[PDB]
Design a protein around this ligand. Sequence first.
Ligand code: HEM
Ligand code: HEM
Lengths: 361, 362
Amino acid sequence: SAVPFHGAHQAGIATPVQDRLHFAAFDVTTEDRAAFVALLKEWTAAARRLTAGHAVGEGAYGGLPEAPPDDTGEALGLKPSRLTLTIGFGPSLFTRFGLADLRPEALADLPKFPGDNLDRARSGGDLCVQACADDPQVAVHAIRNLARIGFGKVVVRWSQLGFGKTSSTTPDKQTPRNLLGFKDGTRNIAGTEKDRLDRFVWAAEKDGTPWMTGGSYLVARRIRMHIETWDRASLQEQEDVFGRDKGEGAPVGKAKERDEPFLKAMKPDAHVRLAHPDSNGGATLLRRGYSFTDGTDGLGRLDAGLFFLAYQRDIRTGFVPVQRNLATDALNEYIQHVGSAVFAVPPGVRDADDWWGSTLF
Amino acid sequence: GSAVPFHGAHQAGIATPVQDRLHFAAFDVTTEDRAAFVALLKEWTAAARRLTAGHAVGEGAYGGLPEAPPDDTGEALGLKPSRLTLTIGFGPSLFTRFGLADLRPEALADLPKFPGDNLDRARSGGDLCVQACADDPQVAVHAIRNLARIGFGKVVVRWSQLGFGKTSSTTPDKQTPRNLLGFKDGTRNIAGTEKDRLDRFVWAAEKDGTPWMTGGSYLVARRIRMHIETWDRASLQEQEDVFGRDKGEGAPVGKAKERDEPFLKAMKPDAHVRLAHPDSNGGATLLRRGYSFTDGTDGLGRLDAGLFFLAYQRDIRTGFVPVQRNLATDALNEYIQHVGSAVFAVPPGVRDADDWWGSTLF
Ligand code: HEM
Ligand code: HEM
């Protein structure tokens, strides 16, 4: 029902995946370091209440009738719904407040990749809040109120709602399906593998940027799916594209979805074969992404796809090589990357006196 | 997780309890072949029967011929029905085709212009529509997708709207939801158990002049943007004055409980509840069934939010049009703008497994 906000790490990374996502990048409008630190503290105070299901500040009502409510109200009477709020700091943030020399090496800018069609308006950002919850309105309310609290000091650059499973109907003993119709998540790092998070996800002190020990690095890609094209392809084309069958999700020739894959049995350009760590010198990702359907465009097509999110200990040893190994992926015929951003995710709020980003400021 | 029954005198999705998610879709028809269209109509009903029960359309999502695309796009596999309802309606522009002109109901009136109106003609109008409501958005999407797929070449999607969470209620025994302005929305609506009020204000009758519309209803849909920036810098008193109810409990001004009957003369002359209330409109009553939406940023540093407003009524001329006309002086106007519109006739329900959608019109 509620995920502990405080911790060595921020919640929302290795904690159970919630049903809905509301992702927002902000740009910073102030040049004042003090102003900004002030805001980070206020934001942390508000996260504490939100994640515990209380209104922000003095509340949503019952105040001076001649002042606007501290909290906008639309969450009154809902449960915290496993709300987690994770903040990240984008590369452009380190050009302000004189932090240029504190940018971590691992927060590397992404190359341009074959096929990229990055929309600048839906790319980048000085910082980000990932808001995950089982109730979409709880998620929206958090983002809405944080934007409200930071107004005049930050603005929302771009926004993405996503959804995964519906927990009030689907078993946790069950893998969700992406909008292409294949199980998605079968081979991933799971929050239970302290060993794999420590090795593959968390930033380590001896990695090079001490303020980031306990943090992680986030890569975000808005990936539109060409659905009407995909739906016209034969069942065998689709299975051929991934290296797994559609119904059970098993690696070709195997019979259970969770049978270890035999990579030589898959077509050389199969998605699973190209993404697999054995084809990538061990590179392994924690994927934590959501499907989106934003509507339909001016030509009658479903504007839908996968808001892809990956956490890793180092962007250079995680996303960049795997993404690069996808240059010839058969999936490329059916997807286009149209947004992208990277963020360093600072370590957690240790206690009630800690604040977001304290290790950096 | 239950399934909602698909057959009945009336289509589901109207008086049915309001499900969490919405995916609305307006279609324009791209065939002139009446037989082409009726065959579409019979194929859609058949899919809809499978979809509302939790099954795949046609031969299923996998296991068919390898060389052939699956009948069902597959992303609902292993998911429950989720109380999915599929509701279809016919826009006024449809009767220009197939020689249907004389069958247009009088009650499917075009809406006049309203002050403040600012209607994007792209996200407006429509030959027909499918309203898909479900508690799982994947389920809702999968239905519209597979429906559009089956109709490729006979209909195309003109526009759609996703509703990420409800702001209506047809079940006054469960908690009322709040809209994006923070107030409860749905308190004094029509409930699915008030059979008397449903006949009086929602279902079309044989005597109403168009017989094939018997047992159906008429749908108005308005896309209404909210100036949340403006609203969020208004005082609590200003906000509460605009509606006439308080924000926390939702009670009429001066009363104590959300469901106490509003005493309209204590409300400001231009308070929303006072103007919308049927006693101020000669008894005009609506069935509200709308959803909240947010469609990213606005590119000006703020969230783009609003309400996708849907109302079912026995006759548009005595439902939405008079109540909306009275809202011309509504204090809420300062914070909203209407930016899409469309009306549909929703026909009777599919009586049994040999019936089909529109069978009474064709
Ligand atoms: C629309 C875009 C994508 C779709 C539909 C998709 C789908 C899938 C599917 C069905 C699987 C097999 C089941 C599983 O998740 O383990 C998979 C695995 C995987 N994908 Fe993707 N993927 C997409 C994009 C990406 C991107 C952009 C990357 C990396 C930059 C990526 C990396 C991986 C990895 C590492 C695996 C695990 C393979 C293994 O170790 O067995 N995917 N993906
Ligand atoms: C963003 C747009 C709107 C918002 C936020 C809004 C909000 C509200 C609220 C808070 C209530 C009070 C509780 C309830 O009975 O549900 C209400 C009632 C009502 N509203 Fe609206 N409304 C909007 C637009 C409209 C429109 C366009 C119409 C009709 C054209 C309308 C008609 C009504 C009616 C008939 C009632 C019931 C009055 C009664 O019998 O007490 N509203 N609305």
